[PDB]
Amino acid sequence: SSGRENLYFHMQKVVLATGNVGKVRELASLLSDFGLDIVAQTDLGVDSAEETGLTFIENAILKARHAAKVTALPAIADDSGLAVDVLGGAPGIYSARYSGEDATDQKNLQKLLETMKDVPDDQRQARFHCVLVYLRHAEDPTPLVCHGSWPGVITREPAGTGGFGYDPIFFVPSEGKTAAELTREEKSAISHRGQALKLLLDALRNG
């Protein structure tokens, strides 16, 4: 249903609001078919935006807007995190810096375990979220939004050393293991980010 401006009708250069080489390579490859030439905001000299939002969507939009503004290019951005039902969605937008200053993945996951230590086994539901947005320009009032999510259950102990962040405490019942126990291909096939990318393909292809 999205309107014109997201695909070339030659190629349109689009900035991705990150400096992550792998994510750029990941999207560049996926959108090159649609004539989109994906480039990292860092390649273009953009510095990171202050992430002021109180939702994943607000953060994604702010990041896209800043990249678009500094480059005069259409922009794609995302924001992601872990939301635990019993904690009202926390860590939420504080996922990466949950344990305050000097946060690391391990201290963050340990803090979540501590916070959840008395939550009964059947009330430990959580979802990873990835919200991807695509803005035509800094002032576009109607960006495309693609929200992927992935449900699971928080463990009481870490298992696995793959992935990053809370993956060692995010159990996936359908797989009978945690996100850190999955291989990259396995995680990539079912994760919140995988789902958000799939959505991004569908919206552009369809209406």
Catalytic residue among 47, 79, 105, 202: 79
User: Is residue 168 within 8 Å of 161, Cβ to Cβ?
Assistant: yes
Residue 18 sits in which domain range? 1-207
166 is in an annotated binding site: yes
CATH of the domain at 141: 3.90.950.10
Q: Would the annotation count 117 as a binding residue? A: no
154: nearest Cα among 70, 78, 69, 91: 91
Q: How is the beta sheet containing 177-178 ordered, strand by strand?
A: 36-40, 12-16, 75-84, 125-135, 144-154, 170-172, 177-178
Query: Nearest 5 degrees, angle CA 147-CA 42-CA 15?
Result: 45
Experimental method: X-ray
Q: Is 79 an active-site residue?
A: yes
3-state secondary structure of 20: coil
Instruction: Quote the number of domains for the chain.
Output: 1
Burial 185-204 (b: 16+ CB within 10 A, else e): eebeeebbbebbbebbeebb
Give 3-state DSSP helix, strand, coil % of the chain, rounded to 5: 35, 25, 40
- The tokens for 6 are 């997201």
How far, in Å, CA of 47 to CA of 41, rounded? 8
